[PDB]
Amino acid sequence: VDDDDKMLAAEAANRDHVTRCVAQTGGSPDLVAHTAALRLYLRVPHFLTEWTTDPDRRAAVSRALALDIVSMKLLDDLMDDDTGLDRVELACVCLRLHLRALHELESLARDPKAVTDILEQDAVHLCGGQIRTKRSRATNLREWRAHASTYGSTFLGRYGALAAACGGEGQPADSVREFAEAFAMTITMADDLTDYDRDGNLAHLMRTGAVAGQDVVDLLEELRGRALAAVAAPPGAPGLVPVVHLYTDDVLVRLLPRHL
Amino acid sequence: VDDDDKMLAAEAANRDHVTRCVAQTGGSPDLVAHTAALRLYLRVPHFLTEWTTDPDRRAAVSRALALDIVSMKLLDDLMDDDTGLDRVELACVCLRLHLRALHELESLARDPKAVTDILEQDAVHLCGGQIRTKRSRATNLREWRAHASTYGSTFLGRYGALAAACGGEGQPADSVREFAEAFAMTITMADDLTDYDRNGERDGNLAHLMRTGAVAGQDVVDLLEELRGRALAAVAAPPGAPGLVPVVHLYTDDVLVRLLPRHLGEAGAGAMATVKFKYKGEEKEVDISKIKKVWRVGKMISFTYDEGGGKTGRGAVSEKDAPKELLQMLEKQ
């Protein structure tokens, strides 16, 4: 029973918890399936809970985070209106998943108040951030990274902080968040360079020559370094070291050559 | 500074808290103006907090409720997507207002879990309820009422419970939510009978079912009188919110007097009234519609009526056996 076996079971359990929840509140098969197809979004709560030593607590925080992350993904589907999904379903299941997550997270938190503290603290940075992102599109790496710091880093940073708040004492909360913010930007770049083929896209700027390949490599190496430092803070999440390498190397080896 | 002046001030203070909070998140002026226009959504929290004795707590709860009610209104605008407002602003301001409401309410709650408990308890009823409302359009009053009890009654009942949970001591939790649920249905009928023309709404719409013939006017009156009675009962429960009695009457009577007649017509209030009397030895009954002239002689009401053809009828009844309709023609003749 290695780390891959824990990750795979966590991912399956998060998926089942989300799909049961979407189904019982009236989600159509198409909306249930859409939800089941959010692979990395169902998997990333396992990474965020790597510092949680009680295996029962860890599975309960992981699936609570999966409900809210999926909820925020459906809200994001609702603002783009481009899935061909029923907007009533999208909106109603979005609210249902989010309210369940609030309840599951508040019942695991040392201090239930800490859930609403973390969600309010940078709500304006996150929500005002997403508005500015979709208004003025990026024209160089500086602007791309600034925007990806909100809908990517601040977005996962919050779930990092929530995993530390509900994962039992001792967790180095600042390092969990630091990990989430660095990892989020690696996978946001990945998504950008995948979702070009599938206007402020890093892929487009790379291909037009507004952004240079070596700069993207340097950012990825900076984010790798930031993620490795965060998981070496005491106590430490050594399990995340191969994870940081896997997602970073994948952008360098498989995705960068598609745009250069 | 009586109850009408407190109620205006509370809406204006909720409006200020909500519009500032929308502007600070990067909501455009149009979206700020949209939330400012939600007058009843902004006032309703004043009704829900009427039982709160400490006025600094009252104003805090009231504005925190306004934040989440408006947020959920933005979510609704985002699912219909017909406002012309930017979808990204609606979603991001929706989330932001909601997260600020959770923080403010959790700061005032007796229990740290009470807010998320109330929001979770009937989340499936509310969320699955709204899905089925748009999935399967109501074709009669029973169906209209069952749909309306989720996105109206359950919707506001939750803010009722949160007002009680966040409103310190002397809150009859069950009665506050009872009032919210009955009042929400009164308000939801008013919206349907209004938004028929304001929004051009047809499928599942109560005004359409009334005009179509699918729902009878008298059944609508009875439901309004039931919701009035339910709301009056809730605000009479000790320690009482007597300030809410004229508010219940105002909204119910407005549906009865102003909106109903636009969908019923000549006389949509049930059966045509009659006058019973004896005349030349026979039992007689005439419809108010056939009564020509009507006048008073002591306690007696004397009158003529169209008997069919050119023939004119004659009668006199005691004022004790006169229908209100005949006595009204007395006053207006």
Nearest to B124 among A24, A80, A88 (CB): A24
Q: What are the tokens at B266?
A: 């000549």
Q: Quick one: which of B131, B118, B245, B26 has its CA closest to A88?
A: B131
Secondary structure (DSSP) of B224-276:
HHHHHHHHHHHHHSTT--GGGHHHHHHHHHHIIIIITHHHH-TT-SSSPPEEE
> Which residue is it, tokens 């017509």?
B265
Interchain CB distance below 8 Å, A26 and B78:
no
Interchain CB distance below 8 Å, B25 and A75:
no
The secondary structure of residue B132, as a DSSP letter, is: H
Q: Quick one: which of B87, B82, B112, B98 has its CA closest to B28?
A: B87
For residue B308, the distance in angstroms to the closest alpha carbon of chain A comes to 58
State the Cα–Cα distance between residues A13 and A59, nearest whole angstrom: 8
ω into A235 cis (within 30 of 0): yes
Q: What are the tokens at B310?
A: 């050119």
Interchain CB distance below 8 Å, B123 and A99:
yes
The answer to whether A81 touches B81, Cβ cutoff 8 Å, is yes
What is the Cα B12 distance to its own chain's centre?
21
State the Cα–Cα distance between residues B68 and B59, nearest whole angstrom: 15
Pick the residue of B81, B96, B126, B131 with the most A CBs within 10 A to test the interface with A by mutation.
B131
CATH architecture of the domain with range A1-260: Orthogonal Bundle (1.10)
Distance, first Cα to last Cα, chain B: 43
> Taking the domains of chain B in order of start, what are their residue ranges?
1-270, 271-333
Other Cβ atoms closer than 10 A to B96: 27
Q: Quick one: which of A87, A108, A95, A113 has its CA closest to A45?
A: A108
Residue A213 is inside which H or E element, if any?
Answer: helix A213-232
Relative to beta strand B291-297, strand B300-308 is antiparallel
Largest CA distance in chain B: 82
State the Cα–Cα distance between residues B239 and B165, nearest whole angstrom: 16
Angle in degrees, 0-180, between the axes of helices B245-254 and B217-236, rounded to the nearest 10: 170
What is the Cα A41 distance to its own chain's centre?
6
Other Cβ atoms closer than 10 A to B307: 13
Relative to beta strand B300-308, strand B311-318 is antiparallel
Q: Resolution of this PDB entry, in A?
A: 2.3
Interchain CB distance below 8 Å, B96 and A128:
yes
Given CB atoms, is B130 within the 8 Å cutoff of chain A?
yes
Q: What are the tokens at A43?
A: 């998997």
State the Cα–Cα distance between residues A237 and A1, nearest whole angstrom: 18
The secondary structure of residue B289, as a DSSP letter, is: G
Amino acid at B297: V
Q: What are the tokens at A242?
A: 């191969």
Q: What are the tokens at B79?
A: 């699912």
Specify the CATH number for B1-270; select among 3.40.50.300, 3.30.300.340, 3.40.1030.10, 1.10.600.10.
1.10.600.10
State the Cα–Cα distance between residues A118 and A141, nearest whole angstrom: 29
Residue A66 is inside which H or E element, if any?
Answer: helix A55-80
Residues 6 or more apart whose CB falls under 8 angstroms from that of B281 comprise none
Residues 69-128 of A with CB under 8 A from B: 72, 75-76, 78-81, 87-96, 99-100, 102-103, 106-107, 111-113, 115-117, 119-120, 123-124, 126-128
**Partners of B312 in the β-ladder:** B306
Residue B318 is inside which H or E element, if any?
Answer: strand B311-318
> Is the sign of the CA dihedral B221, B46, A120, A52 positive or negative?
negative
Q: CB pairs below 8 Å between A and B: how many? A: 132
In chain B, where does DSSP find H-type helix? 3-24, 29-37, 39-48, 55-80, 87-108, 114-121, 123-135, 141-148, 155-166, 173-198, 206-212, 217-236, 245-254, 261-264, 324-331
Closest residue in B to A128 (Cα) is B25
The answer to whether A179 touches A160, Cβ cutoff 8 Å, is yes
Residue B193 half-sphere exposure toward CB, CA atoms < 13 A: 25
Residue B319 is inside which H or E element, if any?
Answer: none
Secondary structure (DSSP) of B169-191:
SS--HHHHHHHHHHHHHHHHHHH
Phi then psi dihedrals of residue B308, to 5 deg: 105, 125
State the Cα–Cα distance between residues B247 and B190, nearest whole angstrom: 14
For residue A80, the distance in angstroms to the closest alpha carbon of chain B comes to 7
